[PDB]
Chain A
């Protein structure tokens, strides 16, 4: 620290970055039409999840 110090750091975010990046990340965790991969798991509950339910038991 002698002859060598530091400074604080803060951030800033406007509404365009907040909604564009927020909706962009939510969409990055969502689907295209948002209805595609729902029935995939709804019907995988009868085929694949049954093994996870038996192992869970």
Chain B
């Protein structure tokens, strides 16, 4: 639950394979795991759509960061084929991936670097940066000027 809470670090599910296996083996708690796998197809849909759901959720988490994870290398670290990653993109087109940038020559994707209108985006960033430096510079300057008065 803590790994699924937030800031999901890219980890291998093989460590979760034995966790789910012993989750089916041990009967002290969460016993009806065989009842979760009761149906021949329902448990398979819950498992495939579960690993799919976390392998999409971690993409939705790393999509906030603009670090350019270079999904071509990520497909190598995850040890999976790029075809089901294209199917994952088929899940992103319905998962509202319209804010992205792809490349015909290479395979690297970009979740940022828009057309960047200078009247809105650089306007906003320059407003928050310049104004934040102005008022933040204003607070601790005279605040420290009042802190040095106690030395007399």
A residues lining the B interface (CB < 8 Å) = 32-33, 35-36, 39-40, 43, 46-47, 50
Contacts and interface: CB of A to CB of B under 8 A. Distances in A.
Contacts of A33: 134, 137-138
Interface residues of B, number: 12
A25 B118 CA distance: 37
B123 interface: yes
Max chain A Cβ within 10 angstroms of own Cβ: one of B118, B127, B134, B135: B134
Contact of A39 (B118, B120, B127, B137): B127
Nearest to B141: A33
A46 B135 CA distance: 22
A50 B119 CA distance: 10
A43 B126 CA distance: 8
B123 A46 contact: yes
Interface of B: 118-120, 123, 126-127, 130-131, 134-135, 137-138
B contacts with A: majority SS: helix
B34 to A, nearest CB: 61
B138 A43 contact: no
B138 A32 contact: yes
B138 A40 contact: no
A33 B134 CA distance: 8
B134 A46 contact: no
Contacts of B130: 39
Contact of B123 (A32, A35, A47): A47
Contacts of B138: 32-33, 36
Contacts of B131: 36, 39-40
Contact of B127 (A32, A40, A50): A40
B79 to A, nearest CB: 48
Contacts of B118: 46
A32 B127 CA distance: 17
